[PDB]
Write a protein that binds this ligand. Structure first.
Ligand SMILES: CC(C)(COP(=O)(O)OP(=O)(O)OC[C@H]1O[C@@H](n2cnc3c(N)ncnc32)[C@H](O)[C@@H]1OP(=O)(O)O)[C@@H](O)C(=O)NCCC(=O)NCCSC(=O)CC(=O)O
Ligand SMILES: Nc1ncnc2c1ncn2[C@@H]1O[C@H](COP(=O)(O)O)[C@@H](O)[C@H]1O
Ligand SMILES: [Mg+2]
Length: 460
């Protein structure tokens, strides 16, 4: 899976940078030795997945040990953590030494990840179908489901992207994405390591941080559309950001659609374009605009190498006929953990995954996503948010009689979460802050409502 790390590297390749988080870093040899030390302490593991160097060591340790890692959002609330811990039943939690873990984890064995540790790299005995990660992802109803992603899916999606993006071990990625979803963790940490390149993770994203790295040796930027929107807003004021983007080898957006207004403001300011790729937790990456292809705003390009894609079958490349994307290939997840019926429902009889995403293809083969089959989802900041579980959390509040949750358009977030509340007392309805704080404390801050509306009645 990472031949630059296992077996332990030597000579020149060993002293190449691997991970950089501000002034902290690990070379390939250092990462292999720190992850090896950690791997020997863990013969399912949770990872307290802060946007910090320890998280890269932890996840690499789990992969070197052949043990599935379950990334935890360090801002998850008590309900969300309890569910993941009960469902995935990890043996221990890998954490940074200084982290303060919440009481939901009080009974789990804690293994501190020491980035200065030096141990052997374990023999690789893993098989291609073995679980690599369990990544919790929201559905439209109920608590999040654990997508079990096999080792083969990581290797294939990363090598497919390498071909599409002309990504090599000479590339230096900058990113500031969360490390408990596949965008930040699989593409943004495991990808550079599989290529033999490096990643500079910003900790918290900022336009200034991205510009600094791109002007100082970083060659690629990955972000969600919100980050590109903030880039587009800042460009007129920020000559160094414009030069940074103009000089980059590749700018990539994913997790949600990049609006054409943001695309064109970047192109107007910098003279170059942002590649979009389309993927999901359950499928990893399906399509992309290629580095050697035509840049076309509002498209997600062509199927990656090894991905079988169909629209439902719609045969014409007419830019009009709307159909459901379905995909098959070695990029696919294994199952939803503990959910064999939901797993079966997600697949056609002939083994294609039903994305729910609606698209056309143009005469060049390029896919344009244009909606959804039956049921809209909520994407806020490029996080997929499930309405049902926010409703269920709101219903616990004593000032809420009934709740419905929707998304509405937001130029920065894409969509923002709306809470529609039948109050306990219509003359004293609960304010937004009380409801937002409650959802943030139960689930996670990124899931909080940003708007509250009061009604007499909501759907049942
Ligand atoms: C952009 C933000 C910093 C903005 O945060 P706020 O302004 O609300 O604070 C945050 O929303 C953020 O970090 N977004 C990243 C969400 C993300 O990583 N999405 C990946 C899940 S989708 C996915 O994994 C599928 C895919 O990427 O193809
Ligand atoms: N570049 C993109 N354009 C439009 N939608 C996207 C893109 N990348 C991902 N998505 C959406 O994100 C979903 C996967 O996000 P997730 O559920 O977080 O794993 C897909 O089903 C799409 O709806
Ligand atoms: Mg609903």
């Amino acid at each position: 899976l990472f031949p630059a790390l296992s077996p332990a590297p030597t000579g020149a390749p060993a002293d190449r940078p691997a991970l950089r988080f501000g002034e902290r870093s690990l070379t390939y040899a250092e990462l292999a030795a720190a992850a090896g030390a950690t791997a020997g302490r863990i013969g399912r593991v949770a990872v307290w997945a802060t946007p910090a160097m320890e998280t890269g060591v932890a996840v690499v340790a789990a992969l070197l040990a052949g043990v599935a890692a379950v990334p935890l959002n360090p801002k998850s609330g008590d309900k969300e953590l309890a569910h993941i811990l009960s469902d995935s039943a990890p043996s221990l939690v890998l954490a940074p030494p200084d982290a303060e873990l919440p009481p939901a984890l009080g009974a789990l064995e804690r293994v501190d990840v020491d980035v200065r540790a030096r141990g052997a790299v374990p023999e690789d005995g893993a098989d291609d179908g073995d679980p690599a990660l369990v990544v919790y992802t929201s559905g439209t109803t109920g608590p999040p489901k654990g997508a079990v992603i096999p080792r083969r899916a990581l290797a294939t999606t990363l090598d497919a992207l390498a071909d599409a993006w002309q990504w090599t071990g000479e590339d230096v990625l900058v990113q500031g994405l969360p490390l408990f979803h596949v965008h930040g963790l699989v593409l943004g940490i495991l990808g550079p390591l599989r290529r033999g390149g490096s990643v500079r993770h910003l900790g918290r994203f900022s336009t200034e941080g991205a510009a600094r790295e791109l002007n100082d040796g970083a060659t690629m930027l990955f972000g969600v559309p919100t980050m590109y929107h903030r880039i587009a807003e800042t460009l007129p004021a920020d000559p160094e950001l414009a030069k940074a983007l103009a000089g980059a080898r590749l700018l990539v957006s994913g997790s949600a659609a990049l609006p054409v207004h943001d695309h064109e403001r970047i192109a107007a300011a910098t003279g170059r374009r942002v590649i979009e790729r389309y993927g999901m937790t359950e499928t990893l990456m399906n399509t992309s605009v290629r580095a050697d292809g035509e840049p076309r705003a509002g498209t997600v390009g062509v199927p990656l190498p090894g991905v079988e894609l169909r629209l439902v079958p719609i045969a014409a490349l007419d830019g009009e006929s709307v159909g459901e994307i379905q995909v098959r290939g070695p990029n696919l997840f294994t199952e939803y953990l503990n959910r064999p019926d939901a797993t079966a429902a997600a697949f056609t009889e002939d083994g294609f995954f039903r994305t729910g995403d609606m698209a056309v293809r143009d005469p060049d083969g390029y896919v344009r996503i244009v909606g959804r089959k039956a049921t809209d989802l909520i994407k806020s900041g490029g996080y997929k948010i499930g309405a049902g579980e926010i409703e269920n959390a709101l219903l616990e509040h004593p000032e809420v009689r009934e709740a419905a949750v929707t998304g509405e358009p937001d130029p920065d977030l894409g969509e923002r979460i709306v809470a529609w509340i039948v109050p306990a007392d219509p003359a004293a309805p609960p304010a937004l802050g009380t409801l937002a704080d409650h959802v943030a404390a139960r689930l996670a801050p990124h899931k909080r409502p940003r708007v509250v509306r009061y009604l007499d009645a909501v759907p049942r």
